[PDB]
């Protein structure tokens with residue numbers, strides 16, 4: 289029997305949080321949208337100025353914006369002079385489960401709080417998140433950071449745990465348990481080609497244990513619905529792409545096109561030629577970004593218009609000699625065309641009458657060109 | 664830190680009730696039931712009722728009725744723990760009064776969530792049950808509920824699945840033996856992206872994640888686990904729908 293010392297502080301907090309009558313609302317959200325959008329976000333950031341967006345960045349941001357819609361989710365129950373008074377904090381401080389691997393292997397799990405989140409845009413939020421991350425990683429966190437957690441987030445889904453029912457400490461209104469973003473247990477045995485061909489996508493089991501003294505089942509149930517609406521919304525990703533300097537149209541949650549691969553093939557062939565004819569019309573060649581509508585005012589380049597969805601992204605199409613390969617996945621086809629035409633080099637080569645000249649430019653444009661040497 | 668602490672008045676009653684539920688040791692049994700049967704049967708029920716005499720059956724009508732008939736099979740599900748003169752005595756109520764989560768949208772938008780009770784459910788057929796349900800609904804909607812309606816809830820039912828919340832782990836209040844949390848009747852998250860023509864061609868159906876949080880001082884995991892199994896047997900049974908069609912004046916085979 290070893291007496292607890294530093295961990296005894298954690299033990300007393302579990303006993304203190306026992307007076308809190310909690311309940312838990314659980315909901316599954318299809319994540320196939322933010323997965324396929326992260327694909328573009330981290331590729332575009334890597335090819336321009338660095339930076340990497342993780343799934344928690346999007347998750348925490350949606351939590352913060354949903355807190356604005358539901359005010360009682362930030363508040364926490366308290367008793368002042370024998371009165372049932374509920375504290376309404378000025379700043380919505382998102383607590384994070386940051387596991388600091390110590391000097392002798394001691395995994396010191398801390399709750400760092402990103403403060404003044406309600407007064408932030410996607411850029412300001414991820415800047416304050418990465419400050420709290422860079423400083424926690426190098427042990428430079430002040431004691432003031434740990435004081436002020438009004439609402440928090442945990443990720444038991446890191447270890448593959450589908451969903452959890454967390455225990456809520458005093459001082460908080462609710463704590464969101466983000467589940468395991470993955471394919472369900474039954475599908476784990478089938479081939480990827482089988483799954484994408486039917487239209488089954490990965491999902492996150494988002495839980496929300498809340499204080500039942502102040503927050504009631506309807507408010508917490510609607511709070512999780514609101515987060516679901518954001519994670520599958522179009523304006524949410526429109527705002528995120530604007531803040532990340534991405535001028536291109538983000539992926540939209542579209543339900544599978546029930547057409548055959550033969551029917552879809554001629555659409556994909558035609559879309560390739562459409563990107564070759566007017567790749568320059570939707571490229572980021574204006575350094576001043578004066579006309580922001582040039583990126584969205586083109587249906588001949590919009591994939592959703594050509595009878596295609598994010599589900600068709602992983603399917604093979606008989607693209608006759610596109611990137612040399614006679615067969616290619618849709619997400620590979622749209623990535624070659626993005627980097628070749630819609631990046632910073634608009635190409636008008638289709639209007640030339642000599643054929644070998646078009647063939648020549650096609651090879652020198654539709655290839656993943658090597659990044660120049662540091663010299 | 665620039666905060667506003669408001670003293671609770673009417674809501675303070677709700678706060679002190681959440682404290683009383685702290686002494687009730689609760690555990691929750693969760694079970695998913697394919698609802699494709701009651702969905703396709705509701706299709707016929709509301710079409711036949713519309714073409715003959717009016718009336719509309721909602722999914723909660725069928726759900727509450729099955730809860731009431733399952734309570735007859737398991738008696739310990741209606742009972743609630745109590746202490747009389749320092750003795751562990753369990754109350755066995757005479758009438759099984761099903762609690763309803765009725766959200767009354769008030770005068771200034773104030774959604775006053777009440778717990779009305781359909782009484783003497785054990786002595787009822789499908790017709791008598793839905794008549795007593797619609798009386799409690801029509802009167803709650805127009806603020807004509809007596810204080811006598813709220814006193815007597817022996818077993819309650821909540822619907823977090825209204826807002827799309829897959830399943831919930833509710834908090835059980837004192838005076839109730841068990842409270843059932845009806846999940847969201849829908850297709851799972853993964854399938855949400857595929858076409859309807861794809862789904863029906865394979866044979867995948869909608870489902871409801873029915874939860875059951877109970878008082879561990881009297882009810883045990885096996886009884887609550889079997890209670891939910893019994894409800895599932897009913898929601899996919901043939902005689903259950905045969906009885907309902909008889910009570911609704913539908914002569915055709917369900």
Ligand SMILES: [Ca+2]
Nearest residue numbers: 472474851853
């Ligand atoms: Ca499943």
